[PDB]
Amino acid sequence: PVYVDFDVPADLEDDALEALEVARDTGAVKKGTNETTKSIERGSAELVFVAEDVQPEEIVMHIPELADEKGVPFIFVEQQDDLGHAAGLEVGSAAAAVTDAGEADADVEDIADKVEELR
RNA sequence: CGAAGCCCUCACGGGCAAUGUGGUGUCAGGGCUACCUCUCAUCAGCCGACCGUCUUCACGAAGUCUCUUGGAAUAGAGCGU
Numbered sequence A: 001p002v003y004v005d006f007d008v009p010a011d012l013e014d015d016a017l018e019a020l021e022v023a024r025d026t027g028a029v030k031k032g033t034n035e036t037t038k039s040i041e042r043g044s045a046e047l048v049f050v051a052e053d054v055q056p057e058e059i060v061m062h063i064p065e066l067a068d069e070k071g072v073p074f075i076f077v078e079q080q081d082d083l084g085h086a087a088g089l090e091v092g093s094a095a096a097a098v099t100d101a102g103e104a105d106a107d108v109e110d111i112a113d114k115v116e117e118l119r
Numbered sequence B: 001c002g003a004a005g006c007c008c009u010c011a012c013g014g015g016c017a018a019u020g021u022g023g024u025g026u027c028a029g030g031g032c033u034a035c036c037u038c039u040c041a042u043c044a045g046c047c048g049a050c051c052g053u054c055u056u057c058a059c060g061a062a063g064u065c066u067c068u069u070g071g072a073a074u075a076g077a078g079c080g081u
Ligand SMILES: [Mg+2]
Pocket: none
């Protein structure tokens, strides 16, 4: 809410979570806010995911401003448990990162482009 | 480093845990990279006392002889242990 500056449509989110499921089974992904933050800093992040229902908002608060000064694209997910299932976890995840995509590189590229147009 | 983890249950199974269980590390700073050497430190865990002290208990030597006084010798005098 405080870190959210744009509303991502349900259709764009469906595409994004589908792309994340094939990103773990082919390439590699990072699960958890700590591992997402280190990826943006180490530069090894292609597309970063962040949940909208994070209480407290502090945990994830930094991701939008950090990704902007590191050129890493980001997208918002409405629910926390859906991002966890998409990353391949029984639990939820406040944030996930795609560390080098796999057979989804063409999809991720377009998702990164659809978000830039949405400001 | 990143689920490699913890709890309940005989098990089955359940619960916890990416908002981080668990590994590493804690100023002889540590970590990462590159090598040298090596450990007996530390932490976890097993076993598990002596002595001493306090209390309680068992065992444990040698006269109940003489005379006088006395209601009564545990007294006096005598002899003995
Ligand atoms: Mg430790």
